[PDB]
Design a protein around this ligand. Structure first.
Ligand SMILES: N[C@@H](CCCC[NH3+])C(=O)O
Length: 486
């Protein structure tokens, strides 16, 4: 509060003296990266006659008697030296540089591109001008900022930490690579509503808001699934949506209340066809955005996502890990007895054959996975929107993709039978009567869409934040520019 006061008085002083501290219409001829690219092969002590007008943030400054030096940093992080010389700008201008410019200020420097005696690419200024007065100083080093401080002040983090910039450009590139992978395969991107009168498509608690236009309660979407399927009925052959979803989770990590989600739907394909596309897409995104399929991790290890990935069935692989065959006909009592013998804590809310089989598979198989693995053929009780298997009874055609031990993507053979889909919702109602506040409510308008006939299709889902976690090992609080904070 004392450092801020000195800079505030300096700003007020400049404004009164006529020196605009936040001027408008400053013309910048080059970005600092353009200056470094053009004169990269410039001799050590040479000097050009090229006039440039550059602007950047002063991050280092050192003043001598007649000659002042300053390191300007552009937004991307490119640095360039500015030389304010007594012979070049005059005494009155040089004195203002020492009195007015502090670390963090944005300044405009107009002069000639030279290379200092030490071979530093510099701008020999003939004029300088304040572009944005900084009332608060920059941190001394990015190591001094905690992680919660980077989240609360991402704007400061992007200035002082080069990796903060890299991750930001990385997310933009990964999302860009996901779209290119889907457009190469003929998928079109549509927009489905985010405010919905009934929020279906997933098992999650929704955010509720009141609409004054409609005088009813609206729900933030938990998934675009039910509206993307209406697009399939309408005639979209290959469709996807890469945008935000909202899930009202409570005191649970790895999942944020708001995250970006990719859902794709493709007609006349099964969950086998979407599993192949999902693997090729992830591997293509790694090539385009990361540059390798040998993913470097923060702990120094290297993770391999190349090649073909293993596939296993849930009931079959769970039976191998337990030594006892588990089938859809296995009783809930038998599953609870196996869990008690393994010292596994069934989370009170978990009940039923399907949820218990999934919890046992996660403990006995899922958590021990390291390489990318597909697990397919799920219990029918826990996959209401998934078509039943061709031959195997009691299971549905769904796969979950595990990369580095984390659930990354999921794919269905979509249930298009409207009579069976209504039966699944009746089973969801009975689960809701038992205490499951995440069960899916019956969406009548969605069933009406299926009753006009939906072609067979396969649908996928994958969180972008989860994808960034697999490719870079960084949590959602690092790959999102402004994560939510109290
Ligand atoms: N709606 C699913 C995504 C996959 C949909 C497959 N038909 C979810 O939220 O997990």
């Amino acid at each position: 509060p004392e450092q801020f006061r000195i800079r505030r008085d300096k700003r007020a002083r400049l404004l009164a003296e006529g020196y605009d501290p936040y001027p408008v219409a400053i013309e910048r001829t080059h970005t600092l990266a353009e200056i470094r690219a053009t004169y990269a092969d410039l001799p050590t002590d040479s000097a050009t006659e090229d006039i440039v007008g550059v602007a950047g943030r002063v991050v280092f400054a050192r003043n001598t008697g007649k000659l002042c030096f300053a390191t300007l940093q552009d937004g991307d992080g490119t640095q360039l030296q500015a030389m304010i010389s007594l012979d070049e700008v005059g005494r009155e201008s040089l004195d203002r540089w020492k009195a007015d410019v502090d670390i963090g200020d944005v300044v405009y420097v107009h002069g000639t591109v030279i290379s200092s005696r030490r071979g530093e690419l510099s701008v020999l200024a003939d004029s300088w001008r304040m572009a944005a007065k900084a009332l608060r100083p920059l941190p001394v080093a990015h190591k001094e900022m905690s992680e919660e401080s980077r989240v609360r002040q991402r704007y400061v983090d992007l200035i002082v930490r080069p990796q903060a910039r890299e991750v930001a450009r990385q997310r933009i590139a990964v999302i860009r690579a996901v779209r290119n992978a889907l457009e190469r395969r003929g998928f079109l991107e549509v927009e489905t509503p985010m405010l919905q009168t009934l929020a279906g498509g997933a098992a999650a608690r929704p955010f509720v808001t009141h609409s004054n236009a409609l005088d009813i309660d609206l729900y933030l979407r938990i998934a675009p699934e039910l509206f993307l399927k209406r697009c399939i009925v309408g005639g979209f052959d290959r469709v996807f949506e890469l945008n935000r979803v909202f899930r009202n989770e409570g005191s649970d990590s790895t999942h944020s209340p708001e995250f970006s989600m990719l859902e794709t739907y493709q007609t006349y394909g099964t969950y086998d066809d979407s599993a192949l596309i999902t693997r090729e897409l992830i591997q293509e995104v790694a090539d385009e955005a990361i540059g390798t399929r040998q993913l470097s991790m923060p702990d120094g290890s290297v993770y391999d996502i190349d090649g073909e990935w293993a596939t296993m069935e849930m009931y079959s692989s769970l039976s191998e890990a337990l030594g006892e065959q588990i089938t859809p006909e296995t009783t809930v009592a038998r599953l609870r007895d196996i869990a008690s013998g393994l010292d596994v804590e069934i989370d009170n809310s978990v009940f039923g054959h399907g949820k218990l089989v999934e919890e046992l598979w996660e403990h006995a198989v899922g958590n021990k996975l390291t390489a990318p693995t597909f697990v397919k053929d799920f219990p029918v009780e826990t996959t209401p929107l998934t078509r039943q298997h061709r031959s195997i009874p009691g299971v549905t055609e769904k796969w979950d993709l595990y990369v580095r031990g984390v659930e990354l993507a999921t794919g269905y053979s979509e249930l298009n039978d409207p009579v069976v889909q209504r039966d699944r919702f009746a089973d969801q109602a009975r689960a809701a009567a038992a205490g499951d506040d995440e069960a899916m409510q019956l969406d009548e308008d969605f069933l009406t869409a299926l009753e006009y006939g939906m072609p067979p299709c396969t649908g996928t889902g994958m969180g972008i934040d989860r994808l960034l976690m697999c490719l870079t090992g960084l949590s959602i609080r690092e790959t999102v520019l402004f994560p939510i904070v109290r």
